[PDB]
Amino acid sequence: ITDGAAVFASSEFNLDPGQLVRIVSTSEGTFEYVGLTLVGHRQVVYVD
Amino acid sequence: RSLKEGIGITVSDLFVATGNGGYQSISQWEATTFLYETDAEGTSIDGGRQ
């Protein structure tokens, strides 16, 4: 994160049921509001 | 029975000729099988029938 902007950098990795995704801030930060939204891909499946 | 050994880079092949005629291609008329080599972290490298 820099100047209120950010850059993403990472590889891919599969996520499975039960797994827990975590995020932490290494250093203290102050602001009014920050919004972070990721993206995933899931296979469409019908159910009952 | 030309044969590969030790997964070397060179692939097994057969080229046969007489004094006059040129060498014939054998793999050109074979049920060759490739693989779907991928850099993806989730491997889907199938053995697609070439």
Contacts of A12 in chain B (CB under 8 A): 40-42
Structure-solving method: cryo-EM
Give residue B44's identity as a one-letter amino acid code: S
What is the rounded CA–CA span in Å between residue B2 and residue B13?
7
Return the C-alpha torsion angle B29, B35, B37, B43, nearest 10: 170
Return the C-alpha torsion angle A20, A25, A31, A32, nearest 10: 10
Quick check: B40 contacting A, CB < 8 Å? yes
Give residue A9's identity as a one-letter amino acid code: A
Given a contact cutoff of 8 angstroms between Cβ atoms, the answer to whether B2 and B13 are in contact is yes
Query: Which residues, listed in sequence order, are joined to residue B49 by a DSSP beta bridge?
Result: B33
What is the rounded CA–CA span in Å between residue B2 and residue B16?
11
Quick check: B9 contacting A, CB < 8 Å? no
CA-closest candidate to residue B23, choices B50, B2, B9: B2
Give residue A18's identity as a one-letter amino acid code: G
CA-closest candidate to residue A43, choices A8, A3, A14, A10: A14
Neighbours of B25 (CB within 10 A): 12
Quote the Cα angle for B36-B32-B48, to 5°: 30
Query: Which residues, listed in sequence order, are joined to residue A5 by a DSSP beta bridge?
Result: A2
Count CA within 13 A, CB hemisphere, residue A30: 0
What is the rounded CA–CA span in Å between residue B5 and residue B11?
9
Contacts of A11 in chain B (CB under 8 A): 41
What is the rounded CA–CA span in Å between residue A17 and residue B6?
42
